[PDB]
Amino acid sequence: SAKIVKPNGEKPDEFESGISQALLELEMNSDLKAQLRELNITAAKEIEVGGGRKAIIIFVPVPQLKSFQKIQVRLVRELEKKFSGKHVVFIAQRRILPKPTRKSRTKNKQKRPRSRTLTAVHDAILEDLVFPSEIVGKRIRVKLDGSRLIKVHLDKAQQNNVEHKVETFSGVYKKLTGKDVNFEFPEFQL
């Protein structure tokens, strides 16, 4: 029952009203029944991207995500059809552990590994962008201006589902961190 999709204390409506009404239909959808009946997303976010489309960011604390990640190619494309071209993405959201510093208060820390740091969660977003292509390697191109354009070396197979979403996935992570991302299929297994 998509009833935590729209409520997270969140002011969305229409798209979270849509995604919940989508997910209820996705619950009522065959092959998509009984994996979304219990797994209802915690929050949704609709931003625009460099591909001119809107990007449904779907928030998952990842007990949810592993079935959302599991399909993600019909499930997005159905909602891309259901919401008229919108490149939906299923973005992980943890309770990201705070800065290791002093004041700018550091209320309680119990253990912060690199399994729970913020740069861990940024890279978890990058994986949840690309479900067909797996990040083989990464090359951050630190420009002479000081700018940095990461070259995400993806799987060179299953690459084409990413290619119409690259313009989205560059547009999404731009709005997330104030920083672009670039995706490559460079020479792996070739």
């Binding site: 390697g137 090359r139 197979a157 297994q189």
Partner: protein, 84 residues
């Protein structure tokens, strides 16, 4: 070389000829293969540099001949990593 080159993306032969821990991107090329030998009635996943026997129950005692390098095969088979 004329000692002035920069290869941000070099040819994939000069890293691929190196040792697996001597690469520009140190990721091995040792891999899994799926054995089509008729000694078993099944297709069994075997690592390349397996170092050991890998057998089955559809076979009794041969699926592969072991090898500390890339593993010895019997009657010819297929092979797929897949995606390393």
């Amino acid at each position: 070389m004329p000692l002035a080159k920069d290869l941000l993306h070099p040819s994939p032969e000069e890293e691929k000829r190196k040792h697996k821990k001597k690469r520009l991107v140190q990721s091995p090329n040792s891999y899994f293969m799926d054995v089509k030998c008729p000694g078993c009635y099944k297709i069994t996943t075997v690592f390349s540099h397996a170092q050991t026997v890998v057998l089955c129950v559809g076979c009794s005692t041969v699926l592969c001949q072991p090898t500390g390098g890339k593993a010895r095969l019997t009657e010819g088979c297929s092979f797929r990593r897949k995606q390393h």
